């Protein structure tokens with residue numbers, strides 16, 4: 001476990017005040033949906049996810065409050081299969097886990113095993129949050145435009161355009177048609193993950209990449225468009241630059 | 256039309272001797288399969304394709320020898336649809352052509368209209384040479400390895416690896432899994448286009464990108480593996496560097 005005040009600290013992004021890990025937990029427990037943003041290959045993020053999950057799980061189970069975990073890394077189409085794994089929990093062994101969940105190898109198991117193991121064997125159910133491969137391929141090949149009010153603005157789409165252009169080093173002029181397709185795919189992924197979170201009957205934590213959890217361009221906008229009255233809280237695990245507007249709490253690593 | 260000796264010239268790549276356009280034609284007429292390699296957005300290539308097609312078409316039709324054109328830009332799965340267009344030739348007007356052929360818009364019509372119009376309205380039939388989108392998606396998601404002797408060597412695959420890496424500016428280390436998928440897709444495209452050419456009962460010209468027509472890494476290797484006794488000839492429309500081993504004739508532009 002990372003050492004608080006030696007290895008990391010936490011800011012409330014609204015006030016920019018440093019807040020204890022315990023005090024952040026007490027606040028997160030108030031939320032109905034907790035978004036946890038990560039960099040997918042970042043080891044310190046993976047440790048942080050276990051610490052936060054463990055503290056929330058312990059408190060909620062001791063109160064008999066249901067608490068589930070949605071994963072950008074599993075599709076929502078997989079839920080029937082995942083419910084079976086939840087049912088057969090005691091029958092799936094640590095090395096059978098990836099097969100039970102039908103883990104997709106686009107997501108390197110190494111980068112997920114620690115968190116997903118702790119999640120899977122607690123009282124939490126794992127939810128698939130995302131689009132399927134087939135769904136993503138279908139959007140790319142051209143489907144009807146996503147409707148929205150705050151989540152689909154030109155401003156959001158352009159921010160997503162430039163982020164993806166930079167992520168893939170794709171010249172905005174040469175690669176215009178491709179980038180607009182990738183933007184629409186991000187928008188659709190965000191909508192689906194929001195759909196899963198908005199309709200869920202138990203308190204829920206999402207693990208997803210930082211661009212997805214961002215309050216500026218991501219899932220939070222789509223939750224708003226769904227007209228949810230759920231209390232939403234966003235915790236981002238920092239890497240590189242920190243935009244306070246992206247989240248409600250940020251973990252900052254030493255550094 | 257480009258002016259011979261002012262705008263372009265032709266080398267026999269075996270001898271590196273300059274050869275007249277008329278003398279190249281007389282040789283091409285001897286072949287059963289003529290591969291014509293292009294750069295897809297290059298205007299002078301497009302003019303060159305019309306000149307070569309016209310000279311071959313005129314000679315062969317005057318002899319009542321059937322002569323057809325296969326296109327990397329249409330899938331072989333489309334043939335039933337394309338045979339209907341061939342049948343309804345006199346009923347499809349210049350502006351209905353793209354709809355009759357079910358043209359895929361990944362290929363910019365502007366870059367194909369001149370050649371495809373001249374082809375479509377002659378006595379030639381248009382053949383789909385390539386994989387379908389669905390076929391390409393299925394290979395990407397993982398299918399069983401292509402078998403071959405000369406066409407699937409590590410040497411060929413590595414050349415394709417580096418070509419694609421450079422074409423897309425994809426760092427060989429970071430993007431290793433992606434590049435191997437793209438290599439396998441090229442290999443499959445080459446195999447299918449070869450399959451179409453090898454089994455065709457009439458003399459045939461293929462239009463395809465230069466990497467596909469290359470005798471070093473492309474379709475010619477797959478034709479060999481099919482054990483065809485057809486006479487094969489490769490004509491490349493140059494751009495940038497010229498590797499003599501890529502083709503049997505090369506058009507060189509001024510320059």
Ligand code: HEM
Nearest residue numbers: 136137138140141168170178182185361388391392423437
């Ligand atoms: C994420 C979902 C994606 C899907 C479903 C998808 C699917 C496809 C399909 C079906 C094609 C047509 C294949 C062909 O005609 O040869 C294609 C082509 C292409 N794609 Fe995507 N792709 C995706 C992501 C990406 C990304 C992230 C990039 C950029 C890094 C990209 C870059 C390209 C390029 C440059 C081509 C041109 C094909 C070539 O000549 O190599 N794609 N893709």
Ligand code: HEM
Nearest residue numbers: 106133136137168182391392393395396423425433437440
């Ligand atoms: C040519 C046929 C292609 C097909 C069928 C295809 C399809 C796909 C699919 C189904 C995914 C998974 C989507 C996801 O999990 O989000 C994907 C991801 C990806 N693809 Fe391809 N693609 C093709 C070509 C390309 C090319 C040419 C490039 C490079 C220029 C490329 C680069 C990428 C990258 C970087 C991703 C990671 C997804 C992301 O995080 O944005 N693809 N592609």
